[PDB]
Amino acid sequence: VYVGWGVKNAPFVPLPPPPVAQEFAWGEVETQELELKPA
Amino acid sequence: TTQVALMKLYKEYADSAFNVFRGAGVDNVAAFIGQEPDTIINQLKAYLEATKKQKAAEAAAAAAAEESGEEITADPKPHVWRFRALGLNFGGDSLEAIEHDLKNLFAFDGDLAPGAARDSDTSRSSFPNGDTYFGSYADDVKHGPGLYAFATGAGYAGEYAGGKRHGRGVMVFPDGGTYVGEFVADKFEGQGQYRYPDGSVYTGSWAAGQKHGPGVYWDTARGCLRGEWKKGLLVGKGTYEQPALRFEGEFVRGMPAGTATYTLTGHRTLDMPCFAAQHIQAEEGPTLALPCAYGIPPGSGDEPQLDTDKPPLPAHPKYEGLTFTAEQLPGAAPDTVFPPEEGKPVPITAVPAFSVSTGLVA
C-alpha cells in the first residue's frame, strides 16, 4: 500500500532557464569583384 | 589605342538582383530599401522559395535524364538574352594585356571607363559562384543602397560601404531566420531584431555577429530572459520570467550558478477559500521568495574555452552536473505580473498574462 503525499525522496533541481538558439553560419559572405590594379 | 570593344551580348537569369527589384514595382533601389521591413522580408523569402524550388526541379530533371535518354546538354535555368551597346578604347599590346578591364567589362554592367574605377549608380554585378548584386558603386567597390542575392537562397537589402555591409539593412538566411537592424562588415553590430526559424525572437544588442550587451530574449516557452550577454552567452545577473515565477541570479557561460533567488506565487489556489480569515481582505498576495543557489562542476565553465581535464557543461535534455541548494525559509516577496515591463512589446504571438487579481488569462 502507498499512503502519503506524492513526492519522491530524490534531490530536486528546479529546471534551469531554457536554452537560447544559435544564429546561421557564415557561409554567407559577400563575394567581391577584385580591386583595380594599382600603378 | 589598339582595341575597341563595341558590344556585349550577355544573358540574364530570371532570379537575380535585377528581378527581385523589378517585382517590387518601386522606382529605384533607394525606394526598394526604403519600404517597410515586412514587405522586404516577404519578397526576399519569396526569392528564397523560388531558389529552393528551382534546385529541387533541377535535381529531379537530372535524375530523370540519367534514368533514360541522354544528357541535358542545355542550361535548365530560365534565361533572357540582353545586349549592351558599349564602345570603349583600350591601349595595349595583345588581348591579355588588359585582362582586368576585360574581365571587369565581363561582369560589372554600369558606366565603364577604361583605366578608371567603377562609379555607376545603377550597376549590376555578377560573380563567380553565381550570386548577384544590384546597386551603386564607388571607388571600385559597392557603396550605397543595394540588393544582393547569394544564389543559395539567402538575400540582403540595405546599405553598403567599404565594399561590404554597413549601416541599416535587412537579411534573410537560407534556414528561414531573418535579421533587421544595423551591420558592421559582414556581421551584426549595434541594435537589431533577429527572428529564429523555430519561433524564438531576440531583440537587442549585437557585436561582431554575436549577441553582446543588454539583451532581451523571448524563447519558444513564452518566457522572458533579460541580461548583459557576452560573446554569444549570458554572463552575470540574469532574469527569467514565466507567468507565475521570476528567477534572478548569476549565469556563467550560459548556465546558472552562484547565489540566486526564486520568487513565485501560488496560482493554483487563488480561487480556493483561504485557510486564515485575515488573508481574505489583505493586500499581500500569496507570493514567496527562496534565496537558493545553483551549483556547477568545479572545473566546468571556469575555463573560457582556452584551447582538457574539464568536465562538460550540462546539456539541455538532462543536466548532469547541476546541483541546487536551499537552506533558509521563504521570505514572502511582493506580487509579480508576468509581462515584465522591460521588453514590454512582445514579438511572440501567443503570450498569456497573469496577476493576483486575475489569473492566467489564456
Coordinates of all heavy atoms in Angstrom, one line a residue, chain B residues 11 13 15 54-55 57-59 61-62 72-79:
Chain B
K11 N 23.6 37.4 -71.0 CA 22.4 36.5 -70.8 C 22.0 36.7 -69.3 O 22.9 36.7 -68.4 CB 22.8 35.1 -71.0 CG 21.6 34.1 -70.9 CD 22.0 32.7 -71.3 CE 23.2 32.2 -70.6 NZ 23.6 30.8 -71.0
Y13 N 19.5 35.6 -65.9 CA 18.6 34.5 -65.3 C 17.4 35.2 -64.7 O 17.5 36.4 -64.2 CB 19.4 33.6 -64.4 CG 20.5 32.9 -65.2 CD1 21.8 33.2 -64.9 CD2 20.2 31.9 -66.1 CE1 22.8 32.5 -65.6 CE2 21.2 31.2 -66.8 CZ 22.5 31.5 -66.5 OH 23.5 30.9 -67.2
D15 N 16.2 35.0 -61.9 CA 16.3 35.1 -60.4 C 17.6 35.7 -60.1 O 18.6 35.0 -60.1 CB 16.1 33.7 -59.8 CG 16.9 32.6 -60.4 OD1 17.2 32.8 -61.6 OD2 17.2 31.6 -59.8
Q54 N 13.6 25.8 -57.6 CA 14.4 25.6 -58.8 C 15.4 24.5 -58.6 O 15.6 23.7 -59.5 CB 15.0 26.9 -59.3 CG 15.8 26.8 -60.5 CD 15.1 26.1 -61.7 OE1 13.9 26.4 -61.9 NE2 15.7 25.2 -62.4
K55 N 16.1 24.5 -57.5 CA 17.1 23.5 -57.2 C 16.4 22.1 -57.2 O 17.0 21.1 -57.8 CB 17.8 23.8 -55.9 CG 19.1 24.6 -56.1 CD 19.8 24.8 -54.8 CE 21.1 25.5 -55.0 NZ 21.8 25.7 -53.7
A57 N 13.6 21.1 -58.7 CA 13.2 20.7 -60.0 C 14.4 20.3 -60.9 O 14.4 19.4 -61.6 CB 12.5 21.9 -60.7
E58 N 15.6 21.1 -60.7 CA 16.8 20.7 -61.5 C 17.3 19.3 -61.1 O 17.6 18.5 -61.9 CB 17.8 21.8 -61.2 CG 19.1 21.6 -62.1 CD 20.1 20.6 -61.6 OE1 20.1 20.4 -60.4 OE2 20.8 20.0 -62.4
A59 N 17.3 19.0 -59.8 CA 17.7 17.7 -59.3 C 16.8 16.6 -59.9 O 17.3 15.6 -60.3 CB 17.8 17.7 -57.8
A61 N 15.0 16.7 -62.6 CA 15.2 16.6 -64.0 C 16.5 15.8 -64.3 O 16.5 15.0 -65.3 CB 15.2 18.0 -64.7
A62 N 17.5 16.1 -63.6 CA 18.8 15.5 -63.8 C 18.7 14.0 -63.5 O 19.2 13.2 -64.3 CB 19.9 16.1 -62.9
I72 N 21.4 16.4 -70.4 CA 20.6 17.6 -70.6 C 21.2 18.5 -71.7 O 20.4 19.1 -72.4 CB 20.4 18.3 -69.2 CG1 19.5 19.5 -69.3 CG2 21.8 18.7 -68.6 CD1 19.1 20.1 -68.0
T73 N 22.5 18.7 -71.7 CA 23.2 19.4 -72.7 C 22.7 20.8 -72.9 O 22.9 21.4 -74.0 CB 23.4 18.6 -74.0 OG1 24.4 19.2 -74.8 CG2 22.1 18.7 -74.8
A74 N 21.9 21.4 -72.0 CA 21.3 22.7 -72.1 C 21.1 23.3 -70.8 O 20.9 22.6 -69.8 CB 20.0 22.6 -72.9
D75 N 21.3 24.6 -70.7 CA 21.1 25.3 -69.4 C 19.6 25.2 -69.0 O 18.7 25.6 -69.7 CB 21.5 26.8 -69.6 CG 21.6 27.5 -68.2 OD1 21.0 27.0 -67.2 OD2 22.3 28.5 -68.2
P76 N 19.3 24.6 -67.8 CA 17.9 24.4 -67.4 C 17.3 25.7 -66.8 O 16.1 25.8 -66.9 CB 18.0 23.3 -66.4 CG 19.4 23.4 -65.8 CD 20.3 24.0 -66.9
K77 N 18.1 26.5 -66.2 CA 17.6 27.8 -65.6 C 16.8 28.6 -66.7 O 17.0 28.4 -67.9 CB 18.7 28.6 -65.0 CG 19.5 27.8 -64.0 CD 20.4 28.7 -63.1 CE 19.6 29.7 -62.3 NZ 20.4 30.6 -61.5
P78 N 15.9 29.5 -66.3 CA 15.3 30.4 -67.3 C 16.2 31.6 -67.6 O 16.7 32.2 -66.6 CB 14.0 30.8 -66.5 CG 14.3 30.7 -65.1 CD 15.5 29.8 -64.9
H79 N 16.5 31.8 -68.9 CA 17.4 32.9 -69.2 C 16.8 33.8 -70.3 O 16.1 33.2 -71.2 CB 18.8 32.3 -69.7 CG 18.7 31.4 -70.8 ND1 18.5 30.0 -70.7 CD2 18.7 31.6 -72.2 CE1 18.4 29.5 -71.9 NE2 18.6 30.4 -72.8

